[PDB]
Design a binder for this molecule. Structure first.
Ligand SMILES: [Ca+2]
Lengths: 547, 49, 584, 713, 98
DNA sequence: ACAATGCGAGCACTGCTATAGCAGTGCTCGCATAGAA
């Protein structure tokens, strides 16, 4: 033996693919079986998206976690895990060229540990745009933003984005994030004395890229800016994956190459993962300015391999005293600074926007979305209260009420189902499908996709690039795949009782999918539980920002 | 039951190279270079024999 | 250049989806398209898909009949052959394309994937010159082409007139390989010893003359060769003309070297009636000023017959959809009724449900009962030995030795009947029958009566086969007699369907229609009918039959009867109409 | 019924031609008597795996195993994925043996490189840690396998392991009984059973068990070496014949089987050539029985000859006899099997045509044999096959070509209207030249006769040449120009396996360093570290954009590890005008190998714009139709006639002929380096160079390539 | 590999007639073919001629008809040794021309 | 989204030392480099 048998069997019982077990064997194999398994699991988690492997999820906790706590070789709790790994030279703290690094109590695949550092290096090098003269800036700002009487957060977002090289703007679907970037650059153009200001728009997906322009063009057309209102954004739609040319695969860009621009604005950033970033950042001319946009609480900012989540964490820290004062200087409004911890270049260029003022409410989808972003009591009495009838519709799913859901489910797709029957065969069936959509946390099961598709296709009997439809056995989509997509009506189906897959950000992104009606088939135990859990987060990006 | 071989033209190159590997690889620089100035590779050795 | 072009074509055929590779295919000189054609065809989206469809058909022709049939199908449409032949040097290009096809055809029947062939091409285009089988086929018209051959290929050959344009060259031997003039041995002086090189250089023209002899020897009426005051030595024309160093020069200048003009004088020396020279009178007149004539008054016979009927010999295969292609050929008695893979159903307590699934193991089971002693008990050693040889693990003997018996002493229908009660004399294993079938057997026509008499065939999807005239093969696992009647037994190893619950009188009658085994019944019995009637001189159905037993080996316990086993008794009135259904 | 000597070597063809016109022309067929082996993928495939313990594991060989569906499927490998693995294997440096022990077992010097374990390691080592970061364990990571695609590496790395488990499992000799499970185990380990294959596989297991049981029966003590069994499994498999379709779906193509003389209305015999039909094989020589014959005895000779008789006897209505009359190569004549000779000879000696009743025995005979004998044509589209009478072909398919009713390919170049836009990335002018014809194909009508599957080195690297050495000279150069550490590069290059072995590798490198240094020094000697520049010129009603790298205040300084070329001068000439136009007054040099150089004098922003136009002009016409201009051939003829003195373009018949030499010399190169003409792009325009289009090439390539010479140095 | 080429084919035959057990082989063949006609002889090689004489040279009851033309021996490059012919020319005294 | 050698000529030029002949250093350039059981 060597350990081989145990591992190879793990593939038989599909509990870690071949790449994982092979990688472990060729890199360790002739070393304490521990290091061998470690690499097998590391490469495992990695496959799932996790950037690193916490020594903790590897210290007696996996006796109830990864199914490979089975051992004759695992010499006790071994404690010296840090010691045992570093001992074998398939792992190092970072010095020698090692496939596996051990920084902090995290075990990374080199490529990862580097990608991370490169990320942290980017948010602790963010120099200040000397383009001060607050005098003018404050003007161009007071003019673009009128109702700044009451602390206008979008006006600060801009101010923060115009006085920094790197900045991120986090906001819900119900914020003027779209138009805030509009004036943001409108003033950027304006304060560009002579010339040489190339602004190129982007997004990880072609779908967002799409909107950016047809919206940045809309809200940009309007307002005051004709001083040659045409060195505008090329309205040119780039996949965050073209600029930095990829070719069937390396990239034409890195540390001296493309990114022919001084100002970059990536949207749907909440969908940028560790790998992409890292390169984009170095590939960015030291003379360029990046403006990230997205929603911090979107399941996409927290799912394995994400970052926008971690990056925007230090927001709740508030600005530094001096920055809070400077921004409040640029905007005719005072700017708080709740507790001066540190991340400086970060905290001072982070900025989350909030919905503004309008009598009445944002009710229904609104209230739910907000409370979901925090406490129970809140989340509880908005459902019962007034029965937002249209907007919210919480229904008890457990036992035989599953067949109750199945009904008001075929009911939702009502419009869709009728176009087929009425044989109205044009493309209105397409627009008809995006009117109603089921959402579930799992991929397989009584709930989940594979499972919900069957039990439902059965009811319409007893009664009757990517994400682009025509039944990929969709009908019921994972909150995940639904990202960047929105439907008029939307119903959420959570597991009966279990799974950590059902976290806050998942519920949140699900709710934010609906435009009008939002059905949520769950239990005031699972819902209230999810409401309290918060998608675990791998990484050292949290630490690399605290040095 | 003999099988009529066809290769050879290849079997021969392979052989000429097995000769170059076990005979030239283990050589120490001073010698290796001499050989090099006589022929650069197994390919060249064959075109001669 | 054609080989490359064809390859691009096979890539288009192999995927007309990808807009590029296809265009690329169409761009090939072989397709005879224009620059204009390419253009327009790019700016007209409907005419593009047109082509795509066209190729998607060719892939179809490829998957079904092969490459040759596909390529020829391609050419016939784009009228390739006819056009190429009319395009200067086209005939050569055609024969080569046809050739490739003949080779692309061989290669086909040696790989089971089209892509595997494409691959096959690349390599050959990259690393060629292999056999003489991939050598170029000469054209049947060349028998009217001035022939340019080598002194060597010419030995033995005869020619009316011959020309030796470069018969003066020589090329001095530098490699010191000579034969010792005393011992007549091949010596290799690994040292350029002038003495030995001198010797070799001698043997050189000693062979050149020998070649010269053969060259002049080839012509019948006349032969004219080219001579010149050749000079290799970089010695500034010092009355050199090392012509004397060539076989022909050596004979003209009788050995001794000569002046440039010295040659011209030696030639004149001998030169009358048969010999005569001239000066290298160059010339020009591009024309071979030949014209042509032609009258293509042809046509191809067209047969006035028609396909009509098709005589085949089917066998309850008019059912089972293919995949068994070549399968029922390599193993005539393979457990064709089983197939698939196995996974994590290994539960640490071996049972008949965990016994390796598939055809290879299924036939192993069938095997056991091919010659067993139902009468006496199941010897474990015979079982241990059966698995040992079959490649299985010995640790299956208990489960198996207990499994077999359980099925033996299993009560068939009612009064007694149990395999173990059957002695040799009342058993006939693996009966092979042939039921002639005249008057086309229409799938629909048979579905009707099969319905009325059988409640099982009530699940009427049937008629999944098409008209067939001929014979009807069929093997019967077992036919025995309980001193009164004859029966039909078919051991059927199937399921991976977990346990017991799947081998209930319901589950069984389900898989029955699932695999439409019901047909097997009616057919098989119809055969036993015909046979028994034939043998038993004056026999009656309901007095001699009363049979039909299906044993789904698995899910059969010592004390859970009616589970695993299934029984049916043909309507007798069905067999009646079914029999005459054959010959009316 | 059609019978042939060897039904195996006729099968391809039988299938081929019976693949004809669906309707009308078609008639079903069934081949029988073929061998199991010669007619089933998996068969020879398994027999192959049974040879692992002897294999060298050459690259192409293992990958060959993947072309077998069932084997690939068994390792979750798709035709999609194979294409990557196939590339990585080549690029990672794999080509030899599986292990190191595999190498030593071959009494060879374990280099620890180019074996599979190496190549795989470089791949998994790449899965993580990227190419840079340096060599891990004397191994340099291979990044092409880094993304989710890195998942494939797991599958391949998983196969070779299985192959190795077994290559070592099947190594030692075992007692007969122990080999029993081996066949079954292997099949499950490398094959995910199809349906057809489920059958073929069962056959393997049968013979395997058979061969072993039989040996056990005779109670064989001593152990058995695999070879013994494989070699037997092979033979059996070679004799097991498939002929289940013998009498169902009509027309039976087969061989002459002894003891199976059935009567047929029609009997056809093909390939009845001398040395081919009366099938031979000489008795063992030590088969006593064959020297002293007796009435009961039997031999093939006798069996076959009496077979030919059974045919004639069994042919009720028509006897068809055919043989090959000449090999389609040396065209020498072949002969009919003596048996066939004995038949027509008898026919002719006992028959006479109606006409000839009073002439002669021999004479009447001839006419008869000649009358029944029918000499066929070489090609199916030969018109003789379409006149009236004896066997007019039933294949209209060929008719048109038989009647020379073709329409010769129409001249490929048809001017295509072109609309000169505004704003052409500098790149499109750079990529247009450096070969324009290509540009018309790739640019104007998206035609890229892409060529990639590229030969995998059937061996490790002993020598560096062509494209590789260049690529290596590129980094070594740059590294020496950046006055960086060449030692780093080396190690990296070696860790990838791109360099010859040790002492020889150290030598290779050392001598390249010497040539690259000489080059770099010429760069360093006048390299004034400058920076990027942007292009946005206005020329005769046209714009342009681009990133001219390292632009020095001197101007432009470029260098490359290759020889001088006109195509390369043009490149820099364009990069220059744009530079001169964009303002910046300076110079521009391109340092090449062998001290070559292309140096251009500063131009006045005005005239720069003047030439940047003509180049811009060519791209225009170039987009309408193939703008000739062969930078090398033309550049040659153009360089032989030009003169630095008085900008003297020579016309004298002395050089006008030397030039025509330099030209053809470049168009069609040596037996070593090989001509500009030798190029698909040009090939599709014309296969042979006509003195006409040659002119067009000069006139045209002179019209654009002249400024290059009028200004160099 | 268990394979055999052509050079080997007529080579292994030359060794056999050389070895001790070379007589049972010489005689065996000799009987089967008491008189043999070798054509295109001017192209033989030492290996061939050896086998030939080792079987028929100086042997009553047998005849070796060697026919070809030395003036046409042009296959040196494949191993046709004109010298081994002249050697054979020396050993057999009976000469004839057409 | 990328190119073979090697050998002497050939002639230009540079010391010597009994303007001419012999020699030697050098760089450029044209020339010749298989056959088919
Ligand atoms: Ca059966």
């Amino acid at each position: 033996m060597k350990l081989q048998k145990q591992l190879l069997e793990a593939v038989e019982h599909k509990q870690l693919r071949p790449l994982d077990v092979q990688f472990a064997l060729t890199v360790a194999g002739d070393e304490h079986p521990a290091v061998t398994l470690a690499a097998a699991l590391l490469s495992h988690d990695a496959g799932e998206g996790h950037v690193c492997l916490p020594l903790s999820r590897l210290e007696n906790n996996e006796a109830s976690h990864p199914l490979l706590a089975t051992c004759v070789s695992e010499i006790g709790e071994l404690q010296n895990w840090e010691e045992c790994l570093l001992a074998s030279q398939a792992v190092s703290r970072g010095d020698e060229p090692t496939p596996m690094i051990l920084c902090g109590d995290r075990l990374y695949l080199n490529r990862m540990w580097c990608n991370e550092r490169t990320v942290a290096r980017f948010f602790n090098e963010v120099n200040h745009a000397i383009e001060v003269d607050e005098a003018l800036l404050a003007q161009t700002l007071d003019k673009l933003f009128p109702v700044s009487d009451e602390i206008n957060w979008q006006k600060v977002a801009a101010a923060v984005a115009l006085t920094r090289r790197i900045s991120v703007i986090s906001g819900g679907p119900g914020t003027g994030k779209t138009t805030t970037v509009a004036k943001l650059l409108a003033a950027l153009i304006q304060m560009a004395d002579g010339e040489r200001c190339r602004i190129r728009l982007a997004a990880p997906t072609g779908k967002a890229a799409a909107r950016l322009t047809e919206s940045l063009g809309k809200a940009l057309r309007q307002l005051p800016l004709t001083d040659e209102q045409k060195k505008r954004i090329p309205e040119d739609a780039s996949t965050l994956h073209r600029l930095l040319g990829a070719q069937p695969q390396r990239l034409r860009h890195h540390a001296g190459n493309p990114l022919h621009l001084d100002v970059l604005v990536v949207d749907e950033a909440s969908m940028i993962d560790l790998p992409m970033m890292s390169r984009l950042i170095d590939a960015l001319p030291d003379h360029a300015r990046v403006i990230f946009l997205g929603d911090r609480d979107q399941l996409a900012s927290v799912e394995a391999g994400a970052v926008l989540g971690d990056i925007c964490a230090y927001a709740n820290a508030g600005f530094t005293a001096e920055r809070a004062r400077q921004l409040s200087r640029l905007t005719g409004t005072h700017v708080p600074a709740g507790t001066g911890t540190e991340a400086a270049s970060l905290r001072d260029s982070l900025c989350l926007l909030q919905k503004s003022y309008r009598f009445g409410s944002d009710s229904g989808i609104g209230q739910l979305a907000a409370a979901i972003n925090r406490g129970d009591k809140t989340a509880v009495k908005t459902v019962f209260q007034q029965d937002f009838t249209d907007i919210e519709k919480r229904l008890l799913q457990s036992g035989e009420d599953y067949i109750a859901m199945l009904e008001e489910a075929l009911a939702g797709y009502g419009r869709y189902l009728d176009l087929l029957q009425a044989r109205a065969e044009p493309d209105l069936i397409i627009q008809a499908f995006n009117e109603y959509q089921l959402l579930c946390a799992l991929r397989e099961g009584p709930f989940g996709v594979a499972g919900l598709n069957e039990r439902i296709e059965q009811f319409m009997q007893q009664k009757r690039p990517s994400r682009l439809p025509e039944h990929e056995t969709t009908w019921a989509m994972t909150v995940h795949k639904s990202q960047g997509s929105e439907f008029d009506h939307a119903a959420l189906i959570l597991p009966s009782q279990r799974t950590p897959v059902v976290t806050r950000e998942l519920v949140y992104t699900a709710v934010t999918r609906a435009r009008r009606r939002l059905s949520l088939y769950a239990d005031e135990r699972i819902l209230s539980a999810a409401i309290a859990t918060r998608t675990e987060r791998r990484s050292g990006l949290a630490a690399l920002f605290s040095s | 039951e003999q099988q009529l071989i066809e290769d050879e033209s290849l079997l021969r190159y392979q052989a000429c190279a097995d000769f170059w590997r076990r005979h030239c690889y283990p050589l120490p620089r001073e010698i290796a270079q001499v050989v090099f100035e006589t022929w650069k590779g197994p390919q060249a050795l064959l075109r001669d024999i | 250049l054609e080989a490359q072009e064809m390859l691009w074509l096979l890539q288009a055929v192999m995927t007309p989806e990808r807009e590029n590779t296809l265009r690329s295919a169409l761009a090939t000189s072989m397709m005879g398209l224009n620059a204009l054609d390419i253009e327009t065809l790019n700016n007209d989206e409907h005419a593009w898909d047109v082509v795509v469809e066209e190729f998607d058909g060719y892939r179809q022709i490829w998957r079904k009949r092969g490459v040759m049939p596909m390529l020829r199908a391609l050419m016939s449409a784009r009228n390739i052959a006819e056009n190429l032949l009319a395009t200067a040097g086209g005939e050569r290009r055609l024969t080569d394309i046809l050739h490739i096809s003949e080779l692309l055809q061989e290669a086909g029947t040696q790989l089971e994937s089209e892509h595997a062939l494409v691959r096959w091409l690349s390599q050959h285009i990259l690393e060629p010159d292999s056999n003489a089988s991939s050598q170029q086929m000469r054209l049947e018209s060349d028998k009217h082409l001035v022939q340019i051959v080598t002194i060597h290929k010419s030995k033995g050959l005869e020619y009316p007139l011959v020309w030796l344009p470069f018969i003066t060259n020589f090329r001095v031997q530098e490699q010191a390989f000579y034969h010792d003039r005393h011992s007549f041995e091949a010596v290799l002086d690994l040292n350029a010893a002038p003495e030995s090189v001198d010797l070799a250089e001698a043997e050189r023209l000693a062979e050149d003359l020998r070649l010269l002899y053969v060259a002049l020897t080839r012509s019948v009426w006349h032969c004219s060769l080219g001579v010149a005051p050749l000079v290799r030595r970089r010695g500034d024309k010092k009355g050199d003309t090392d012509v004397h160093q060539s076989a022909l020069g050596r004979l003209l200048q009788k050995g001794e070297p000569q002046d440039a003009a010295g040659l011209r004088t030696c030639i004149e020396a001998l030169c009358d009636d048969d010999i005569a020279w001239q000066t290298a009178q160059t010339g020009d007149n591009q024309p071979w000023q030949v014209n042509d004539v032609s009258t293509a008054e042809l046509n191809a016979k067209t047969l006035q017959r028609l396909p009509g009927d098709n005589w085949r010999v089917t066998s309850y295969s008019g059912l089972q959809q293919r995949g068994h292609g070549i399968a029922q050929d390599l193993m005539p008695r393979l457990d064709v009724d089983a197939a698939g893979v196995a996974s994590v159903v290994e539960e640490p307590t071996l049972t008949p449900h965990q016994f390796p699934r598939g055809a290879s193991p299924g036939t192993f089971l069938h095997s056991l009962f091919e010659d067993l002693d139902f009468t006496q008990p199941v010897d474990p050693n015979w079982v241990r030995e059966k698995l040992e040889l079959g490649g299985f693990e010995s640790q299956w003997e208990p489960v198996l030795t207990e499994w077999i018996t359980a099925v033996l002493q299993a009560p068939l229908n009612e009064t007694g009947v149990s395999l173990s009660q059957l002695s040799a004399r009342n058993k006939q294993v693996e009966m092979e029958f042939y039921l002639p079938i005249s008057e086309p057997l229409i799938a629909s026509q048979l579905d009707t009566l099969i319905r009325q008499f059988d409640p099982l065939s009530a699940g009427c999807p049937p008629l999944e086969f098409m008209q067939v005239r001929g014979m009807l093969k069929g093997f019967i696992d077992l036919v025995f007699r309980h001193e009164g009647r004859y029966y039909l037994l078919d051991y059927k190893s199937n399921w991976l369907g977990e346990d017991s619950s799947a081998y209930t009188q319901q589950a069984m009658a389900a898989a029955m229609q699932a695999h439409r085994y019901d047909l097997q019944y009616q057919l098989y019995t119809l055969a036993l009918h015909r046979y028994l009637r034939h043998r038993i001189a004056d026999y009656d159905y309901e007095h001699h039959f009363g049979g039909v037993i299906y044993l789904f080996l698995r899910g059969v316990d010592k004390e859970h009867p009616q589970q695993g086993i299934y029984t049916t008794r043909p309507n007798a009135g069905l067999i009646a109409l079914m029999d005459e259904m054959f010959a009316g | 019924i059609v019978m042939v000597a060897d039904i195996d070597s006729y099968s391809p063809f039988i299938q081929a031609v019976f693949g004809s016109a669906p309707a009308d022309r078609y008639l079903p067929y069934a081949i029988s008597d073929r061998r199991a082996r010669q007619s089933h993928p998996v068969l020879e495939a398994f027999i192959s795996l049974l040879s692992l313990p002897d294999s060298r594991f050459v690259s192409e060989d293992v990958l060959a195993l993947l072309d077998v569906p069932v084997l690939a499927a068994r390792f979750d490998i798709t035709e999609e994925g194979l294409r990557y693995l196939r590339q990585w294997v080549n690029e990672s440096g794999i080509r030899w043996g599986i292990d190191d022990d595999n190498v030593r077992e071959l009494e060879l010097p374990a280099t620890g490189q180019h074996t599979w374990r190496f190549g795989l390691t470089r791949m998994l080592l790449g899965y993580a840690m990227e190419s840079a970061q340096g060599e891990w364990q004397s191994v340099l990571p291979y990044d092409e396998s880094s993304g989710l695609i890195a998942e494939l590496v797991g599958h391949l790395a998983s196969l070779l392991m299985q192959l190795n488990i077994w290559r070592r499992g099947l190594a030692q000799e075992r007692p007969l009984e122990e080999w029993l499970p081996v066949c079954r185990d292997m099949l499950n380990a490398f094959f995910l059973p199809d349906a057809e294959t489920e059958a073929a596989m069962t056959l393997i297991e049968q013979q395997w068990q058979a061969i072993i049981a039989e040996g056990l029966g005779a109670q064989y003590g001593d152990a058995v070496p695999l070879s013994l069994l494989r070699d037997e499994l092979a033979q059996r498999l070679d004799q097991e014949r498939i002929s289940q379709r013998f009498l169902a779906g009509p027309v039976n193509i087969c061989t002459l089987m002894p003891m199976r003389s059935i009567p047929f209305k029609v009997v056809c015999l093909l390939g009845m050539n001398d040395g081919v039909y009366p099938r031979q094989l000489a008795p063992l020589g030590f088969d006593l029985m064959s020297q002293k014959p007796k009435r009961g005895d039997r031999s093939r000779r006798d069996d076959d000859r009496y077979l030919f008789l059974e045919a004639l006897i069994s042919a009720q209505q028509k006897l068809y006899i055919s043989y090959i009359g000449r090999s389609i190569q040396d065209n020498s004549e072949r002969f009919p099997s003596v048996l066939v000779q004995e038949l027509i000879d008898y026919i002719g000696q006992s028959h006479y045509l109606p006409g000839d009743e009073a002439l002669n025995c021999d004479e009447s005979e001839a006419r008869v044999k000649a009358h029944l004998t029918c000499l066929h044509t070489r090609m199916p589209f030969d018109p003789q096959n379409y006149q009236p009478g004896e066997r007019q072909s039933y294949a209209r398919e060929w008719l048109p070509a038989a009647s020379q009713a073709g329409k010769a390919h129409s001249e490929f170049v048809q001017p295509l209207p072109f609309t000169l836009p505004e704003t052409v990335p500098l790149e499109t002018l750079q990529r247009f030249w450096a070969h324009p014809v290509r540009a018309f194909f790739q640019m104007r009508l998206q035609v890229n006769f892409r060529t990639e599957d590229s030969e995998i080195p059937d061996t490790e690297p002993f020598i560096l040449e062509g494209l590789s050495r260049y690529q290596i000279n590129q980094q070594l150069l740059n590294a020496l120009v950046e006055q960086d550490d060449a030692e780093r590069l080396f190690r990296r290059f070696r860790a990838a396996g791109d360099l010859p072995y040790g002492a020889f590798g150290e030598i290779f490198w050392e001598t390249q360093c010497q040539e690259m240094q000489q080059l770099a020094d010429r760069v360093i000697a006048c390299r004034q570290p400058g920076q990027s520049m942007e292009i946005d010129l206005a020329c005769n009603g046209v714009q342009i954009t681009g990133w001219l790298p390292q632009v020095q205040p001197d101007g432009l300084l470029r260098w490359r590890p290759s020889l001088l070329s006109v195509a390369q001068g043009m490149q820099l000439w364009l990069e220059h005008l744009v530079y001169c136009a964009s303002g910046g007054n300076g110079e521009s040099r391109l340092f090449l190998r062998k001290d070559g150089e292309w140096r251009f004098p500063p131009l006045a922003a005005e005239q720069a714009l003047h030439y940047l136009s003509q180049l811009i002009e060519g791209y225009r016409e170039g987009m309408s139709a193939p703008l000739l201009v062969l930078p090398e051939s033309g550049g040659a003829w153009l360089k032989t006639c030009y003169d630095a003195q008085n900008d003297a373009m020579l016309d004298d018949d002395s050089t006008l002929q030397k030039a025509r030499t330099k030209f053809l010399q470049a168009y069609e190169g040596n037996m070593m380096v090989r001509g500009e003409g030798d190029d698909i792009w040009y090939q599709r325009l014309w296969r042979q160079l006509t003195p006409e289009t040659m002119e067009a090439i000069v006139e045209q390539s002179q019209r654009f390539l002249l400024p290059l010479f009028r200004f160099n140095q | 590999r268990g394979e055999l080429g052509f050079d080997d084919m007529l080579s292994r035959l030359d060794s056999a007639l050389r070895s001790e057990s070379g007589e049972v082989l010489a005689a065996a063949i000799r009987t089967r073919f008491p008189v043999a006609m070798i054509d295109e002889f001017q192209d033989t090689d030492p290996q061939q001629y050896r086998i030939f004489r080792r079987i028929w040279h100086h042997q009553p009851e047998t005849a070796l008809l060697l026919i070809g033309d030395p003036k046409q021996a042009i296959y040196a490059f494949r191993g046709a040794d004109i010298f081994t012919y002249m050697k054979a020319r020396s050993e057999v005294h009976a000469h004839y021309t057409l």
